[PDB]
């Protein structure tokens, strides 16, 4: 595991990016709020555990041609019970990428 990349990168139209993530968010039944045209706070109910999870998406420019989608988990406030805040964040991000977005 050598090279770690922050978020994902795209050369799509920024507006096309934001509009599409919003479309994936609503299809997945998440709630969300638009803070900026490039910054979203999303919140999901766990269909299994009934717990809530929050994250932030922020769009950045790297090239004059290229943009980067950033994902940030937002913090809340013997056998294991169901649920993990960390894994569920990854799954959120994963669901969102799959549903808004295609590989080049």
């Amino acid at each position: 595991s050598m090279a770690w990349h922050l978020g994902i990168r795209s050369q799509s139209r920024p507006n096309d990016i934001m509009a599409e993530v919003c479309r994936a968010i609503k299809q997945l039944d998440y709630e969300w709020k638009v803070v900026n045209p490039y910054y979203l706070r999303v919140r999901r109910k766990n269909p299994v555990t009934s717990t809530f999870s929050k994250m932030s998406l922020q769009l950045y420019q790297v090239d004059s041609r290229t943009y980067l989608l950033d994902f940030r988990s937002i913090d809340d406030e013997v056998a294991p019970r169901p649920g993990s805040h960390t894994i569920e964040f990854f799954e959120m991000c994963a669901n969102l990428i799959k549903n808004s977005c295609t590989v080049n």
Partner: protein, 71 residues
């Protein structure tokens, strides 16, 4: 009563902000940095496997979790 007028900033959000709050785009880790916490990192996709990763705090301890997940 006269018609009123509207001055719209418009190009306040012309383009996404430029990157670095010194947030690192790429981290190389071949066999700390303070606030890339809670942010998503990923390896290049290989043979239909995703590897997601982040660093979180519990009290004063930090764990970097890596998930290996098929697509």
């Amino acid at each position: 009563g006269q018609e009123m007028y509207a001055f719209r900033s418009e190009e306040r959000f012309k383009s996404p902000p430029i990157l670095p709050p010194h947030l690192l785009q790429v981290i190389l880790n071949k066999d700390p940095n303070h606030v890339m916490l809670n942010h998503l990192y990923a390896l290049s996709i290989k043979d239909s496997v995703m590897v997601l990763s982040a660093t979180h705090r519990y009290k004063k301890k930090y764990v970097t979790t890596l998930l290996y997940k098929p697509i």
